[PDB]
């Protein structure tokens, strides 16, 4: 037998690598918003007053000492911070004449994928039983399994960036 | 919940229409590039042997396919 399907993550032959990451970086940003947006009322500041995967991991947010915020406020601030990167044409050029900055992968793509993965961590560790009662585990796993294969294809996330789901992500590759 | 059930239904059918269009491009991109290489090879060893014009028409196609990929993330 052979290897995978959504191995569409492979870079098309003869094309820019920064673009193939930037388009997928925007795409996973949309997919994650659809996942969390459907359980938007199962994750409230009363349910998750602290942005956490399992009680060992906690993600703070800086507005500059980073403070502890609830899960919906951390995601709301994360997505508003991602749109500041996309609207910045010096980073995500919307005109076909514009180009990417130096180190666009290490300075833009990887920092965004590090933060966006943390929404996957919160959904699995604190809302999987509620996702299970919505026929969304199929959509959640597919969107997450595609996220890891794309990050593994281009070495975008270190094992330390897979914090709580590092054991779960070992049943791939 | 009548307010969550509407968002869960549209969330599932989004990824369907999304991943279906995703594979629609990735297999059409590979089938368009397949005909460009086959056209570059079948004109490689005719006369002219234009090692630049075939190398330039190859870049012209990649740039023309590059702008297609960029517009896939710039939704109005
Ligand atoms: Cl894509
Ligand atoms: Zn939550």
UniProtKB/Swiss-Prot annotation, chain A:
Residues the record lists as binding Zn(2+): 43, 48, 122, 127
Gene Ontology terms: biological process: cell division; exit from mitosis; mitotic cytokinesis; regulation of cytokinesis; regulation of exit from mitosis; signal transduction
GO molecular function: kinase regulator activity; metal ion binding; protein kinase activator activity
Cellular component per GO, a single term: mitotic spindle pole body
Transmembrane segments: none
Main location: cytoplasm
Phosphoserine, modified sites: 90
Entry superkingdom: Eukaryota
Keywords of the record: Cell cycle, Cell division, Centromere, Chromosome, Cytoplasm, Cytoskeleton, Metal-binding, Nucleus, Phosphoprotein, Zinc
Subcellular location: Cytoplasm; Nucleus; Cytoplasm, Cytoskeleton, Microtubule organizing center, Spindle pole body; Bud neck
PTM text: Phosphorylated by CDC15.
Family: Belongs to the MOB1/phocein family.
Record text on subunit structure and interactions: Interacts with protein kinase DBF2 to form the MEN DBF2-MOB1 kinase complex.
Task of the protein: Functions as an activator subunit for the DBF2 protein kinase. Binds to DBF2, which is required for the phosphorylation and activation of DBF2 by the upstream kinase CDC15 in late anaphase. DBF2-MOB1 is part of the mitotic exit network (MEN) signaling cascade, which regulates release from the nucleus and activity of phosphatase CDC14. Required for inactivation of mitotic cyclin-dependent kinase for exit from mitosis, cytokinesis and G1 gene transcription.
Additional remark text: Present with 5020 molecules/cell in log phase SD medium.
Official protein name in the record: DBF2 kinase activator protein MOB1
Organism: Saccharomyces cerevisiae (strain ATCC 204508 / S288c)
UniProtKB/Swiss-Prot annotation, chain B:
Domain of life: Eukaryota
Subcellular location: Cytoplasm, Cytoskeleton, Microtubule organizing center, Spindle pole body; Bud neck; Nucleus
Induction: Periodically expressed in the cell cycle, with a peak before the onset of budding.
Additional detail: Present with 3500 molecules/cell in log phase SD medium.
Record's subunit section: Interacts with MOB1. MOB1-binding is required for a late mitotic event.
Similarity comment: Belongs to the protein kinase superfamily. Ser/Thr protein kinase family.
Role: Ser/Thr-protein kinase involved in the mitotic exit network (MEN) and required after the metaphase to anaphase cell cycle transition. Phosphorylates CHS2 to regulate its dynamics and chitin synthesis at the division site during cytokinesis. Coordinates septin and actomyosin ring (AMR) functions during cytokinesis through the phosphorylation of HOF1. In complex with MOB1, phosphorylates CDC14 at sites adjacent to its nuclear localization sequence, thereby retaining CDC14 in the cytoplasm. Also binds to SWI5 and CLB2 mRNAs cotranscriptionally to regulate their decay.
Name of the protein described by the UniProt record: Cell cycle protein kinase DBF2
Name of the gene: DBF2
Residue range from the parent sequence: 97 to 172 of 572
């Amino acid at each position: 037998s052979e290897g995978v399907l959504n191995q569409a993550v492979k870079l098309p032959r003869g094309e820019d690598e920064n673009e193939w990451l930037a388009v997928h970086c925007v795409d996973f940003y949309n997919q994650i918003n659809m996942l969390y947006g459907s359980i938007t009322e199962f994750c409230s500041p009363q349910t998750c007053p602290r942005m956490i995967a399992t009680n060992e991991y906690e993600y703070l947010w800086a507005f500059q000492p980073p403070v502890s915020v609830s899960a919906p406020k951390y995601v709301e601030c994360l997505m508003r911070w991602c749109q500041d990167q996309f609207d910045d044409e010096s980073l995500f050029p919307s005109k076909v004449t514009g180009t990417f900055p130096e180190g666009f992968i290490q300075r833009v793509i990887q920092p965004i994928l590090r933060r966006l993965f943390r929404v996957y961590a919160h959904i699995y560790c604190h809302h999987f039983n509620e996702i299970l009662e919505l026929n969304l585990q199929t959509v959640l796993n597919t969107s997450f399994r595609h996220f890891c294969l794309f990050a593994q294809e281009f070495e975008l996330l270190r094992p330390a960036d897979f914090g709580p789901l590092l054991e779960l992500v070992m049943e791939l590759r | 919940s009548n307010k969550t059930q509407r968002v869960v239904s549209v969330c599932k059918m989004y990824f369907l229409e999304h991943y279906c269009d995703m594979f629609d491009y990735v297999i059409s991109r590979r089938q368009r590039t397949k005909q460009v290489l086959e056209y570059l090879q079948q004109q490689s060893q005719l006369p002219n042997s234009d090692q630049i014009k075939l190398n330039e028409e190859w870049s012209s196609y990649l740039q023309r396919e590059h702008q297609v990929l960029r517009k896939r993330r710039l939704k109005p």
